[model samples]
Target: ASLVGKKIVFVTGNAKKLEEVVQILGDKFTCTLVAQKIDLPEYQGEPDEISIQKCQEAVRQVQGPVLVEDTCLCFNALGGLPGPYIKWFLEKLKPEGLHQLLAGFEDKSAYALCTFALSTGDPSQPVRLFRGRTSGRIVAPRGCQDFGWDPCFQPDGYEQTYAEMPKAEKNAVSHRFRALLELQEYFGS
Candidate 1:
């Protein structure tokens, strides 16, 4: 319960991302998820490596336990072309353009992945990564434009894109939700 007694800092500047983590983890965990908007350098690499670096850097700055997340939207056809650089992709290509990248290919299949890394305020201690993925296909943007490529991704077994779904509904089945579930369990242990 000592971990729960301390406020675990979540390194992020995205207000909405922080909100989702707070909502998905809920109050039962009893550990507060507080955001410290530090402009940590975006290390270029694979998703997990990026998350681990971000977390370790955050722990160095916060001098406490810190959590950092990175989300990726990968197209199977492109061999995960933009796995960890989704933010740039979204910015340059936009959701519709992202879908167009697969226009010539038959496989529109894709996956949304989230990786979260936790550091215990020590560089010597190994950071742990909790990952979650949701399988889906790319489509033309079809919903609210509030967040990333949500409007373009239709998760398997569902007809609505993430942006089309209610906030609570998206939180229930999102990749971030799955990752945070693992995170919650880690803290619970």
Candidate 2:
């Protein structure tokens, strides 16, 4: 189960995400985090579909064991308005916009969904996809602990939003962590 010699490239420009992934997987693997600034087309489709497509494209361009990760926030009240485009939506519309979107609605049931795709060097090899989800509700006013929607995301089993919890605690049960665990399990087997 030791990935001491593994060199997996994560296709993301966000350094925070790279650090987070390293925190989760570094103990088991010798990971190299690389960020590509090239802008690729954001395809219109399900989160998993888009992730797979992007990973395949990155693999074709890089010719290595490249991985791509995509995440979404699906709100029950909004009928998953920003399912796959959560980041873009967040950039265009901040937390205030999200609050406005949920004005008067008491139902805050939601989940953070993440899909990770691993593409090997050979195009003929099938891509490996891993998915993880953390169900929760949305909060208002926001907390100051975590980044992104963490300030307003209350996981299903917890009372406080992710932003309210310590980084170690949040990282232990995050959607990305769950997905990485699945990947680790697969690698172990």
Candidate 3:
């Protein structure tokens, strides 16, 4: 991957998530996942919408190639209430509480979505959004590993929640991983 040794900024406040991204990207790039503490104004729209705005703004303020990522947990029963509103939802609910919101619901299904907005240092090149969704069902909080809704989400055909698995194992099937692959493939071509 020629992306190796290239310096790119991944705008994120959570260093842990940033670290995960770096790992997922592999040694292909000298990715700098920094906590610049910039305020990304989220919306009630889809993940791409939020990511586009974030990447646009992040590139505008940052010096070089910058990418922004947004994640969402969409429950079919809840009409995806927490689509782009997951951070806000986290303020109110734990993984356990999130599970409770689906109480008595039969579907028990949800989509884990990730959007990656990639932008280089050029003004002409518009920000691009790559999105991926993983099919899963919301189960009671189990395992004591991952973050957010990880503990409650059982990916399709998997008996373990995201939190239950190791970081590498979970990322192998994660929405973010799929989206990252899309972005890389796009760049490679």
Candidate 4:
């Protein structure tokens, strides 16, 4: 067995998410992630399908090893309303309003879903997907206001929200981190 250095273009505009991914994937593989700013279109569909499409679009522009990610916040009570559209929900409702969306319902159970798609610059070949889901519930915004939706999501078995936890702590169990672990496994395999 042999290992080779790889460069993966992480197609995203969010610096914070990229930062977190970098921290979580630290030295796990002989690979580096470079960010590419692309305004790729996200069509309506399930989370996985949307992620695959996003990766496909990314490879269309960047003809090399590329990685793309999509995230969602799903509430059990709402039957996953605003599933893949959590970004819009967060932008329009803000954290407080998002919490209020569950005011009338008893079940506040929710999960943070992250899907990562990796392509070897092959537009014709299917991209590989690594998905991670973290069970948590929405709460009134708490802690830091640096990143999107982190202030409101309190992961299961944890008292503090994602924003409240330290960067290392949150990344230890984050949806993004979990998904990246799978990606690491792929490289190792």
**Candidate 1: deviation at residue 47, Å?**
0.8
TM-scores of the candidates in the order shown: 0.89, 0.83, 0.81, 0.86
Candidate 1 lDDT tens digits, 1-189: 256677889877888778878876767766777888888998888777788878888888898878888889988998986788878988988989888878999999999998999876767778999988999989998898867889999988889998898877887778888888887787665
lDDT of each: 0.84, 0.75, 0.77, 0.84
Highest-TM-score candidate: 1
Q: Model 3 clash pairs?
A: 146-163
List candidate 3 stretches off by more than 4 Å.
Answer: 1-7, 14-19, 26-37
lDDT of 3 by residue, 1-189 (tens): 233345677877788878876666666445455555677666556667777777877877875678777889889898886778876766688888888888978888998998888787575877878888898988888888347778988899789998897777887789888998787567643
Instruction: State, as a TM-score between 0 and 1, how close model 3 is to the true structure.
Output: 0.81
Prediction 2 global C-alpha lDDT: 0.75
Listed per model in order, the count of residue pairs whose N, CA or C atoms clash below 3 Å is 0, 0, 1, 0
For model 4, residues 88-180, the per-residue Cα lDDT tens digits are 998998888889999999998899998899888866677899988899999988997767888889999899999899877887778878888
Model 4, residue pairs in steric clash: none
Report model 1's TM-score to 2 decimal places. 0.89
